[PDB]
Amino acid sequence: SNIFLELQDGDKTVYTHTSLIEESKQEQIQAIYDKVPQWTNGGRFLGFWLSMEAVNRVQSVAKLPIYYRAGIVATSTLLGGLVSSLVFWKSGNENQVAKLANGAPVYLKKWEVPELSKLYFFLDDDNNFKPSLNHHAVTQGRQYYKIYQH
């Protein structure tokens, strides 16, 4: 699960990463991002079906150049997918991921967001060889912005 999130902390627009969230919730987020293309592809079919049913059965658009008839179906195809993506996110999903990110650290700038799977760590002999971020080349700390609340 390698996904960068953009959350709204009131007026602020903050950023985080799914790797900074417990694995129990990374699955719920990944499952949401996995249903988007099925809502996108599903909407492209309707926009393609409804458009093809109109440019042919309606004897007002059928009496037009094929290029105009093909542009309507093409425009209605991708447009039907964008509408489905909005209804998917705006309905209850865009607010659900924010709830799933409750407790995760956030940052003001996307460039400050680390990927936990990309950080350097070592096995601390003084702590039963547990993995530690506080390696012998560390100086100051991490100092994120705040914990997300929703």
Binding site: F121, F122, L123, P131
Partner: protein, 61 residues
């Protein structure tokens, strides 16, 4: 000390088209991610030792 340091086995690639069993078997193998465990000695390949179970076909002379 020199003999001891020399027995610490080196890393030898698993990829092999010279042994016909691997030339066939490796076409069906799935390369899975080897997640770093914090070490510099992860034996994610075979080892350059004659007694290794995946390197015994190699002639160390």
């Amino acid at each position: 000390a020199t003999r001891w340091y020399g027995r610490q086995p080196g890393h030898l690639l698993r990829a092999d088209t010279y042994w016909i069993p691997n030339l066939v078997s490796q076409r069906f193998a799935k390369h899975q991610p080897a997640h770093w465990d914090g070490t510099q000695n992860m034996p994610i390949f075979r080892l350059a030792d004659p007694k290794h179970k995946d390197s015994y076909m190699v002639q160390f002379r």
